[PDB]
Amino acid sequence: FMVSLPRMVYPQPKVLTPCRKDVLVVTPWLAPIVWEGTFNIDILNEQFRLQNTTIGLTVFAIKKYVAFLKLFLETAEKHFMVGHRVHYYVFTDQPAAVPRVTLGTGRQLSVLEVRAMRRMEMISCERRFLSEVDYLVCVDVDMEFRDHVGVEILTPLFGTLHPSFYGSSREAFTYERRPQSQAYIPKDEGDFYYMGGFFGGSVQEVQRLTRACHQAMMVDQANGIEAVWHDESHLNKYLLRHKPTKVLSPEYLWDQQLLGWPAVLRKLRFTAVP
Ligand SMILES: O=c1ccn([C@@H]2O[C@H](COP(=O)(O)OP(=O)(O)O)[C@@H](O)[C@H]2O)c(=O)[nH]1
Ligand SMILES: OC[C@H]1O[C@@H](O)[C@H](O)[C@@H](O)[C@H]1O
Numbered sequence: 104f105m106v107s108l109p110r111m112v113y114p115q116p117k118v119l120t121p122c123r124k125d126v127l128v129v130t131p132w133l134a135p136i137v138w139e140g141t142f143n144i145d146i147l148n149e150q151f152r153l154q155n156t157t158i159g160l161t162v163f164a165i166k167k168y169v170a171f172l173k174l175f176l177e178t179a180e181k182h183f184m185v186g187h188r189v190h191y192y193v194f195t196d197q198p199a200a201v202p203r204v205t206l207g208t209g210r211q212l213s214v215l216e217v218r219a220m221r222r223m224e225m226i227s228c229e230r231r232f233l234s235e236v237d238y239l240v241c242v243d244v245d246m247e248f249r250d251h252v253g254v255e256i257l258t259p260l261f262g263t264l265h266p267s268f269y270g271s272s273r274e275a276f277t278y279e280r281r282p283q284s285q286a287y288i289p290k291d292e293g294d295f296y297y298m299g300g301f302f303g304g305s306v307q308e309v310q311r312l313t314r315a316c317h318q319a320m321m322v323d324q325a326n327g328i329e330a331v332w333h334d335e336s337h338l339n340k341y342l343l344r345h346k347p348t349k350v351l352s353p354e355y356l357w358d359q360q361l362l363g364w365p366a367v368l369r370k371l372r373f374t375a376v377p
């Protein structure tokens with residue numbers, strides 16, 4: 104049950120004025136593609152706080168990657184779902200190397216020790232996530248938040264446009280192209296190339312995705328084949344056959360050193376560390 108929004112004063116949306124004319128802002132299966140200028144974050148924050156939303160954020164920091172956690176978490180605290188309840192789950196082989204980062208109120212961190220592709224299996228923590236959070240966001244650790252990443256991304260299932268391919272035709276996508284792999288996608292198929300480093304959704308839809316990618320990876324292992332881009336190839340296969348309900352623009356996963364700051368990106372929200 105969703106209670107009424109309170110009165111709010113904001114600019115009227117005008118039907119004969121698009122928000123953004125330069126980019127596609129809805130997919131052909133009617134999923135929003137999330138760019139700056141397409142959402143009023145005050146309306147969204149109301150909607151999600153009225154449901155007392157809790158967001159889980161998973162990150163793996165194995166071996167040398169523990170070095171990235173301090174900047175990742177400190178910038179998450181500045182930019183990720185601020186005002187909402189957040190539970191970080193840090194999966195690592197070195198619990199004692201997790202930095203002590205001060206968190207804002209309503210935010211918690213759990214360190215989950217693992218042994219040093221297996222992210223999909225490890226995510227598919229099933230029971231715990233179902234009890235503890237409403238949505239799961241699953242990202243790479245060698246990154247930093249530079250600007251707002253908030254509830255505009257939440258939906259039952261989302262992927263993120265890979266920043267090297269958002270302008271590419273499908274035949275250039277680096278999907279797995281060998282029919283012997285579960286991740287295979289023919290040259291005349293594909294909507295987008297999604298980045299393995301940022302996907303998420305409701306806990307149920309994320310457990311479906313990560314279970315299906317884990318099973319498909321195990322089939323490929325039994326068959327002696329490893330997909331060209333590992334879990335990212337399987338995530339692409341899954342999202343072609345199970346369309347996401349939102350797609351995040353490359354504002355949400357960018358590399359300024361490699362790609363600069365094109366005009367089409369009004370904000371660079373989550374970016375690779377040099
Ligand atoms: O030795 C490793 C290799 C990978 N990762 C985790 O797996 C993610 C994906 O690997 P990586 O970021 O190296 O892929 P890239 O983005 O460079 O292609 C890393 O962000 C970490 O989040 C890790 O923790 N330790
Ligand atoms: O072609 C796909 C690849 O593109 C790279 O730019 C990225 O570093 C890789 O992790 C993989 O996503």
Ligand SMILES: [Mn+2]
Binds near residue numbers: 243244245300
């Ligand atoms: Mn990475």
